[PDB]
Amino acid sequence: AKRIVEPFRIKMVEKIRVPSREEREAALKEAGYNPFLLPSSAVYIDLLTDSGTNAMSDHQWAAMITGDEAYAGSRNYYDLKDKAKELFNYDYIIPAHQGRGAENILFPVLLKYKQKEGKAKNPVFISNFHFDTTAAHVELNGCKAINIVTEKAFDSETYDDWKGDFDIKKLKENIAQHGADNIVAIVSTVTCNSAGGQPVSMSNLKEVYEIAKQHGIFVVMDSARFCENAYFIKARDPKYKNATIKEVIFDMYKYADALTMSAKKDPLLNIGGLVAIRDNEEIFTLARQRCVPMEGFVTYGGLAGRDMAAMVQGLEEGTEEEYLHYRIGQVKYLGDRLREAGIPIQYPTGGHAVFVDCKKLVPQIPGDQFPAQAVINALYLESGVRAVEIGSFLLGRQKHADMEFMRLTIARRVYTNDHMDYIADALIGLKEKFATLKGLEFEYEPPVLRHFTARLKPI
Amino acid sequence: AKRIVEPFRIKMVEKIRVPSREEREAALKEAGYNPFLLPSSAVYIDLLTDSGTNAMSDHQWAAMITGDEAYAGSRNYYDLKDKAKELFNYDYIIPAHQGRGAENILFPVLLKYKQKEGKAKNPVFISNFHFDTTAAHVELNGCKAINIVTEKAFDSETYDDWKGDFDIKKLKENIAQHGADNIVAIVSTVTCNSAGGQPVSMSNLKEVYEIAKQHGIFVVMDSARFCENAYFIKARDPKYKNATIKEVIFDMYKYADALTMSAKKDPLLNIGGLVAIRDNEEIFTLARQRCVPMEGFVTYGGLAGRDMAAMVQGLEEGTEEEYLHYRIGQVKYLGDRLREAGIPIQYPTGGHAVFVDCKKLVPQIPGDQFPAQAVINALYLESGVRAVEIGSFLLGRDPATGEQKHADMEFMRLTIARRVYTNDHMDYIADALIGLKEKFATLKGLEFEYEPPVLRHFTARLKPI
Amino acid sequence: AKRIVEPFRIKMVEKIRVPSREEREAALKEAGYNPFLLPSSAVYIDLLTDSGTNAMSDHQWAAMITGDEAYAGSRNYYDLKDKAKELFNYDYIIPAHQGRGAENILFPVLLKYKQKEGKAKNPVFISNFHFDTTAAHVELNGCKAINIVTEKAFDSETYDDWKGDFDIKKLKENIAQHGADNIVAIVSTVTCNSAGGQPVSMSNLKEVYEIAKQHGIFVVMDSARFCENAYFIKARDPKYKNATIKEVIFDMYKYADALTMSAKKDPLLNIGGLVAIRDNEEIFTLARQRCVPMEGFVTYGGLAGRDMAAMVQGLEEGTEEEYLHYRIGQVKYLGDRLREAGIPIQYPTGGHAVFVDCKKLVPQIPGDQFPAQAVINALYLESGVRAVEIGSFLLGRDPATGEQKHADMEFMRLTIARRVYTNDHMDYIADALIGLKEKFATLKGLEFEYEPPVLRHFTARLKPI
Amino acid sequence: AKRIVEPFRIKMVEKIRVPSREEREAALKEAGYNPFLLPSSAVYIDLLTDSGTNAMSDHQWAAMITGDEAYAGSRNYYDLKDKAKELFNYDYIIPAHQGRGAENILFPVLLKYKQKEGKAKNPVFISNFHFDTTAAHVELNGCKAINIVTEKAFDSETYDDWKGDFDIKKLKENIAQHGADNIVAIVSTVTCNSAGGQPVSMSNLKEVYEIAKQHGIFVVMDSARFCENAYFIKARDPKYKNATIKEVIFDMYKYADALTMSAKKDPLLNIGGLVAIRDNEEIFTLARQRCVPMEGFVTYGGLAGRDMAAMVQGLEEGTEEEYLHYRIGQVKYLGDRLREAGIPIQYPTGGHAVFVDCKKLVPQIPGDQFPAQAVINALYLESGVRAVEIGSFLLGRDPATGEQKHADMEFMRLTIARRVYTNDHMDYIADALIGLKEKFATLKGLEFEYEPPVLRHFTARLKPI
Ligand SMILES: C=C(/N=C/c1c(COP(=O)(O)O)cnc(C)c1O)C(=O)O
Ligand SMILES: C=C(/N=C/c1c(COP(=O)(O)O)cnc(C)c1O)C(=O)O
Ligand SMILES: C=C(/N=C/c1c(COP(=O)(O)O)cnc(C)c1O)C(=O)O
Ligand SMILES: C=C(/N=C/c1c(COP(=O)(O)O)cnc(C)c1O)C(=O)O
Ligand SMILES: c1ccc2[nH]cnc2c1
Ligand SMILES: c1ccc2[nH]cnc2c1
Ligand SMILES: c1ccc2[nH]cnc2c1
Ligand SMILES: c1ccc2[nH]cnc2c1
Ligand SMILES: c1ccc2[nH]cnc2c1
Ligand SMILES: [Cl-]
Ligand SMILES: [K+]
Ligand SMILES: [K+]
Ligand SMILES: [K+]
Ligand SMILES: [K+]
């Protein structure tokens, strides 16, 4: 395992504390054995998500302080529009308060657009893998969310360069089965969060887009972790060995018609989202009409001016290769600590998190008992580390998936490699108990995005 | 007119500038004679809205710096829950990114909740006056938005204590006509923004709530400007002359079952919203289920932790009587400068804005040529001040005929952000409008260069005639 | 009286409050009847000083956030060096933590420099008027501080354009009497704080410098309020009617060899100072050698990097004519409110404060009973406004006699921080002082309960008579 | 070597960069082969000092935002006074802009106090080891600075628990030689910076103070790194094994009469200093009288209010044992990386820096050719890391002879700012120095191009040989 030094130094700290074992047991009981319902005061190192927990730079805070809070025509709106043109070559933007706000703006518009001419009676979205909010918005609008990630993603220990790729054979099969007139959009998720933060190759994005254009299908790039994807393309595709990260990004967005983005990920923010559209003015106009009631007026989109300002700066910082090398290298370091100790993980590690394969760590659990959640809860009790489940629990409707990950999710520029060692050493310490204590049931199950507020029972 | 001194001093400033007349003429032309299309760089004093443009305190900024950005279980979420219990006596909260986010969380839930009982067959919402976003959410969910403000609100020049009140007679006529089965909720808007920021009396809130309950009707308090409403109750209702602002607020919320709030108004924020529910845990659970896909996880609701932190502090600051007296007194000062010069306004002034009645200023301009927009544009060209139209332009066309809907009032709204502008800025505004008195009679009406089929007020491009 | 609108809007506020009358009486007694010993919690509007109490801009706070805290070679040091070259055409800088630190760096070096040449046998400094800290440093180094302001400054009610001017006849007389060999430096104080914030004309600065150069005498510009001085030159000297403020500043600094600056004044800071030297590298090197033990390493001079960053930005903002017009216009407004009501002031008002002439206002209180302090204390008890004395109390006792020094000027200074208070705060101050019209006669003097052997106005305790 | 995890997480970052070898070559030549003259833009990891380069907490920044900038009576002054009473049990405070400002306030006052008693005819100060600014103020006031650290400090490789201790035999010998009447004060430096950041035991502080009291000698605690010293006492003195850090601090300050503090060290600030006096009100009063001309008014002492606020919070954070364990553990980690690779260091490592013994690394370079500076320059060219010399270059010339003063130790100090760098930064530092092991034997010394007569290490220009 190799430690890579921060390409920055620390300018402001935030205190953390280790709650006592008694506190942790009490807190997990009070939370119904669901870490989503734990208070932050009961958590030491928080690995629930890399979303919105990032550390900003002094330049981002400075941008916030001079942000323009105007209701209409904020300076920072125009700066953000210019930044989207620079990075993606897209001519239209709509800010949103975060990624699922961007989805709520755009997906219903794309559906109604497709329903023109009386077609799309059996509407579907197709993705390498829809994230949970993404699929929820697809289904809330009466559509099916189809996932067709490469089968290589399902072999955790076997290395592959591009475990986020679309399965192209399945893309063509689904077009033939459903018909192009029923495919509202193809969603290219970069990196592929559900597969383990695994990258999509440039050739895969390109072929998917060429197929989509053959059939007149609109392509949306789900862009929360687009810079991590671009880094992997530079690292693993020899064609881009000597390209800049921004050159890689520019090419990626040749292979979509629009993007939805949670800027709470790679743009290094605590809040913020974005819709950008390459050149379809009609869809832009319709999306603006939905933005107004759902998010806010179209030049702030549910964001304070200071957050548009932070986003303009964060979009730049998130592309910096030295930063990306360190960030992705820290995730790799945590994974290598675990793998060298015999802990099974999705290999190679993705951009933002280490995905621990609990199907191999705890094969004696079925999806009936959510294997990765029993691991997560045991780790929390042992160490005060909070992680999150990316398996049957999150996928929804006991529908068992093809992956049962515990996601040790790593915020950007927050934790050191000594925090990583603490995480790894704590889990490595659980090895005599992975068989003892095990299993979980439901008490309360929401019908949509159940994992966030459900209460569970062990056995 | 009386100037009331600030109960604070200035700690940080932001430069503003007056573009040259040549630059203002070019900018208005480029914006299609629609100030909503102007960049902020072309605006000197911005009176488009009081929403999200407020100046925060040093304590609010300090709260932001120590805010907890945890995705689940932020320290500031629990502080916000405790604050809602303190102020409103409500037991459940869901943060939202702003007021229309709170509406999107709660209103669909209220409709489905009533549909589930075999009711809401032909559903409606009733308010003293639904704000634009509020009505849009009512209509997006297949319901009609019925507004029944007191008739006193339509006599602009005649003083009344409570121009935001519900018309109780119309409330009963609408209940008889639609039946309680079809009334998804009553929305008590405090202050009543669309009537001119005018207050709703305590006795009116109470009587509306009593009628609603006797009919099984859920009541939502639209609370963006709840502190300004509380101030007017203390100022004008003898029974509350010696009450604290917080005591007034506590009584107000005895007369709703829940609240939706834009915290971009009275809680002195640049972003933020809130749903609070008094004690109906089922509705709270259903609203949480909608919050997750639309806004965010239920302990941040689409806000950064720093903004929940700022909201907890701003909720306190927005109740402070010395601040409210100064804030509402500044609005009154602007109004009295205008009224004393013969400019007709909605009288008395409300909490957050002066509404200028443009019918009388430009009688050569009929309603379908947007008299208030012509005055706003002349004001901008004269001074760099940007105001907003609450008249025929905003009102739109009648779907049945395609013709301009008859505007009951043609208002220019001079909307005042909190703790941002001084009374010398107010004088600049008033002097600019007063100085146009001779020009009013020769202002030209407006027609459409480009009219969108919806939301024309925001993006339509206009031409002088 | 004319109110001039702010060329900015408020972005962050800070609460203030009025202590009750009972609290003000108790507080003044505990402070030994010296407002310098009052806590800020006992003060409503604080007019003790314009030093370090200014409101910064969002750009200044942004500059602080990205400031370089390096001990050696901070980015912001080089930015500050460039800014001094831009504004003054001076090639060398040494930051200092504030103005009296700059004086402590430079004045002992100028003395030693004059001595190493075999001169300065009986050394003196000459100024239009040395500020208190400035004179203290002159005297701590064994020199006499000679003040030779124009006699026009002593006629408070009679308007003059340049009440801060040197008396040129007295300058020549003092050089002839003491000898050029004994004049360590001439200090041109701009504006002339002790005369009432009153400007020095360009022609006066030039003549003083020309005389100095003919004699080989070094000239230091005491530059705390250099932008206010530049504004008055543009306003009152027809030669500069169409010059920019920066053009005026550039010309001013042709008439010194170095500057000492409290950046807590016109550069709009809460802390900060500066030495700049035009081109004498030997004096620069010697000043750096004193900086190291007294202030800090030579690239931060006792300041955090963020404060050098704020100074770079504030130096720019402090030169902006729109801001200066408003700032000086607010001081003028307070002065005109008072003068129109018959209160005697130093007329015209200076840049930063209204100086109320208390010899005229309370002639029944002898100088050694501190007439201006009796007014100040009386104003504080009546209103919670804290002002400061610039008269006998500040002046102290004569060493040769042990008795009170006779003062030419007996001012109560209403000192105005920059961008902090509105003109409605000014009205509060004026109305409070005007309301004391009838009590002015009954005002007692005061007597000492304990007197510092030196620095009595900062730490002494008083009792009424 | 053992890595200790941060008891915090990162909330804000600042970009750093490795200049190219070409850039480093050009920058070092321009800086005259003296890293003190490098711009920070030429430095990758800056180990010049732990003074003022620390990372603050969100709570410290929040305290700054609400800081009271009042010239007299700031809220934060009273908070700081209370904090000094809590931590030290001292009843009087004077803020200062930084540590050498506190020295400038207090040391001249202690001399005058001893002189007016008829004493101090041939005055000296005695310390375990005076830091260079501290000795400079002693000498500037006409006194001799006597250093009497334990001889154990000069055996770098041999462990000892208390390498900062006073040599008690030498203390009694110096009292006998000079006489108590001539000893103005004893200065207890904690930790002993010049000995390698090495701690002073509680029993040593106590015996020194008991000896001082026997003879009527005033004791000052130089307290820049008092929390690091307290940590070492808890770690190494069994009497305090179960004491809190604050309990250790409280006992330490039973053994002084006053303190001078650079708050740019253990209180985790970028600027700030402090004088505190236990109970001698006369010395407090005299110190206040010097504060006014040199630093500022007595309730801010040359600091912005926001910096007094940050100091109140940092004083608390600097005592937290979990933080001290990590901070001191990081320094020990760097030291163990070096020592495990055969690089000689002062062992055990102290609180704030690793001191590399270059007398052992480059024996072929004599002291007057600055062996430690040769190592420092090689490290900079190899890696972009800037370190500082604590050896013959710093020590300077004997004023009697004009030749090199003999250095008892030739240290390269790798000084670590608090909460700024990670242990992976430490690995970069260590790997860079370890990779030079074969180059050391052929490094050449340095000679002068420009040499100040007083403090040549801060500004001298050198050339290789
Ligand atoms: C919350 C995270 N994900 C959000 C996300 C979203 C939704 O973004 P917001 O959380 O900003 O609504 C959309 N698309 C992808 C690929 C995502 O990963 C997370 O992975 O924890
Ligand atoms: C934008 C403003 N109003 C918002 C508003 C809203 C919507 O809040 P947001 O703008 O925070 O979505 C809801 N209810 C009332 C009574 C309102 O006044 C405005 O009046 O300009
Ligand atoms: C403190 C103020 N004056 C400071 C000052 C100083 C001393 O600056 P500091 O207060 O920053 O040390 C020097 N020269 C002049 C002309 C000054 O006005 C005051 O006028 O209240
Ligand atoms: C600058 C550091 N030392 C400052 C210092 C000082 C002087 O403090 P200021 O740098 O804050 O003036 C006084 N006493 C001790 C023991 C010190 O270590 C340093 O060690 O690099
Ligand atoms: C894991 C954790 C939090 C999330 N919020 C949205 N999707 C998520 C996945
Ligand atoms: C197997 C194959 C290729 C790999 N690249 C990195 N680790 C690997 C393991
Ligand atoms: C005026 C100003 C802003 C608005 N946002 C929504 N409706 C509005 C009316
Ligand atoms: C008046 C006010 C503040 C001062 N600081 C130093 N001298 C002063 C005189
Ligand atoms: C090394 C580094 C910085 C210093 N400041 C004062 N003496 C020093 C020695
Ligand atoms: Cl109906
Ligand atoms: K967040
Ligand atoms: K806003
Ligand atoms: K200050
Ligand atoms: K610093």
B277 contacts B257 by C-beta, under 8 angstroms: yes
Considering chain B, tell me which residue range(s) the CATH 3.90.1150.10 domain(s) occupy.
1-57+320-462
Buried b (16+ CB within 10 A) or exposed e, D159-197: ebebbbbbbeebbeebbeebeebbbbbbbbbbbbbbbbb
Strand B124-127 with B183-189, pairing: parallel
Point out the ligand nearest to the CA of residue C376: 8
Considering chain B, tell me which residue range(s) the CATH 3.40.640.10 domain(s) occupy.
58-319
Which tokens hold the place of A113?
A: 């657009």
- B357-365: long-range pairs with CB below 8 Å, 24+: B357/B156, B357/B157, B357/B409, B357/B410, B357/B411, B358/B391, B358/B410, B358/B411, B358/B412, B359/B409, B359/B410, B361/B440, B362/B440, B362/B441, B362/B443, B363/B441, B364/B441, B364/B442, B364/B443, B364/B445, B365/B443, B365/B444, B365/B445
Q: Which residues surround ligand 11, an ion (CB under 5 A)?
A: A 52, 270; B 69, 304
Residue C12: list chain B partners with CB under 8 A: 10-12, 55-58, 61
Q: What number does the ligand 5 atom closest to the CA of A132 have?
A: 7
Question: How many Å lie between the centroid of ligand 2 and the Cα of residue B271?
Answer: 11
Helices and strands in chain A, H and E counts: 16, 16
Q: What's the CATH architecture for B58-319?
A: 3-Layer(aba) Sandwich (3.40)
CA-nearest of C363, C338, C463 to C413 is: C338
Cα C120 from Cα C115, distance rounded (Å): 5
Q: Take atom 20 of ligand 2 and give the residue whose Cα is closest.
A: B49
Cα B373 from Cα C126, distance rounded (Å): 65
Q: Which residues surround ligand 10, an ion (CB under 5 A)?
A: B 122, 178, 182
Q: Which of B388, B414, B456 to mutate to test the pocket of ligand 7 (most atoms within 8 A of CB)?
A: B388
Cα B19 from Cα B3, distance rounded (Å): 28
**CA distances (Å), origin A343, targets A193, A346, B367, D6, D301:** 21, 10, 74, 25, 58
Q: Collect all residues from B whose CB is shorter than 8 A from any CB in C.
A: 3-17, 45, 55-59, 61, 419-425, 427-428
Per-residue HEC secondary structure of D257-312 comes to CEEEEECCCCCCCCCCEEEEECCCHHHHHHHHHHHHHHCCCCCCCCCCHHHHHHHH
DSSP H helices, D116-243, are: 132-140, 168-178, 202-214, 226-236
Torsion angle of alpha carbons D341, D344, D349, D354, nearest 10°? -90
CA atoms within 13 A on the CB side of D455: 23
Phi-psi region of D57 (alpha: psi -120 to 50; beta: other; left: phi over 0): beta
Residue A52: list chain B partners with CB under 8 A: 69, 71, 300, 304
CA-nearest of A383, A329, A330, A374 to A356 is: A374
Cα B379 from Cα B392, distance rounded (Å): 18
Q: Terminus-to-terminus CA distance in chain C, angstroms? A: 37
State which residue of chain C sits closest to D39, comparing Cα positions: C73
Cα C48 from Cα C25, distance rounded (Å): 18
Nearest Cα of chain B lies from the Cα of A97 at a distance, in angstroms, of 6
Which tokens hold the place of B23?
A: 């630059």
A351 lines ligand 1 (CB under 6 A): no
Cβ within 8 Å of residue A73, ≥6 positions away? A299, B37, B38, B39, B40, B41, B42, B43
D184 contacts D123 by C-beta, under 8 angstroms: yes
Q: Terminus-to-terminus CA distance in chain A, angstroms? A: 37
Residue A63: list chain C partners with CB under 8 A: 62
Considering chain A, tell me which residue range(s) the CATH 3.90.1150.10 domain(s) occupy.
1-57+320-456
Q: What number does the ligand 7 atom closest to the CA of B133 have?
A: 6
C183 contacts C124 by C-beta, under 8 angstroms: yes
Give the total residue count for chain A: 459
A261 DSSP β-pair partners: A274
Q: Which residue has tokens 């928080």? A: A46
Which tokens hold the place of D285?
A: 């009063």
Nearest Cα of chain A lies from the Cα of C58 at a distance, in angstroms, of 5
Point out the ligand nearest to the CA of residue A223: 1
Strand D446-450 with D461-464, pairing: antiparallel
Residue B75: list chain D partners with CB under 8 A: none
3-state secondary structure of B261: strand
Cβ within 8 Å of residue B207, ≥6 positions away? B166, B168
Strand B124-127 with B144-147, pairing: parallel
CA-nearest of C16, C13, C20, C21 to C40 is: C16
Q: Which of D46, D47, D51 to mutate to test the pocket of ligand 4 (most atoms within 8 A of CB)?
A: D51
Q: Which residues surround ligand 12, an ion (CB under 5 A)?
A: A 69, 304; B 52, 270
Residue B454: CB atoms within 10 Å: 11
Cα A95 from Cα D32, distance rounded (Å): 52
**CA distances (Å), origin B221, targets B207, D18, D260:** 14, 58, 59
3-state secondary structure of D403: coil
**CA distances (Å), origin A115, targets A121, A137, A184, A219:** 8, 17, 9, 16
Q: What angle do CA C161, C167, C170 make, to 5 degrees?
A: 170
| Fold of the CATH domain B1-57+320-462 | Aspartate Aminotransferase, domain 1 (3.90.1150)
**DSSP for C256-295?**
-SEEEEETTSTT--SS-EEEEESS-HHHHHHHHHHHHHHT
Residue A60: list chain B partners with CB under 8 A: none
The gap from C-alpha D159 to its chain's centroid, in whole angstroms, comes to: 21
Q: How many CB pairs under 8 A join A and B?
A: 152
Question: How many Å lie between the centroid of ligand 3 and the Cα of residue C262?
Answer: 6
CA-nearest of B135, B134, B115, B133 to B123 is: B115
B125 DSSP β-pair partners: B145, B185
Cβ within 8 Å of residue A121, ≥6 positions away? A182
Least CB-CB distance to C70: which of D46, D136, D298? Answer: D46
DSSP H helices, B268-304, are: 281-294
Residue B342: CB atoms within 10 Å: 10
3-state secondary structure of A240: helix
Catalytic residue among B90, B92, B129, B131: B131
CATH for A1-57+320-456?
A: 3.90.1150.10
DSSP state of C255: G
Q: What number does the ligand 7 atom closest to the CA of A71 have?
A: 3
Gyration radius (Cα) of chain C, Å: 21
Subunits adjacent to chain B (3 or more Cβ pairs under 8 Å)? A, C, D
Cβ within 8 Å of residue B442, ≥6 positions away? B364
- Technique of determination: X-ray
Q: Take atom 3 of ligand 9 and give the residue whose Cα is closest.
A: D49
D385 contacts D392 by C-beta, under 8 angstroms: no
Nearest Cα of chain C lies from the Cα of D133 at a distance, in angstroms, of 6
Subunits adjacent to chain C (3 or more Cβ pairs under 8 Å)? A, B, D
CA-nearest of C439, C373, C444 to C404 is: C373
Residue A370: CB atoms within 10 Å: 27
Q: Which residue has tokens 């950008």? A: A276
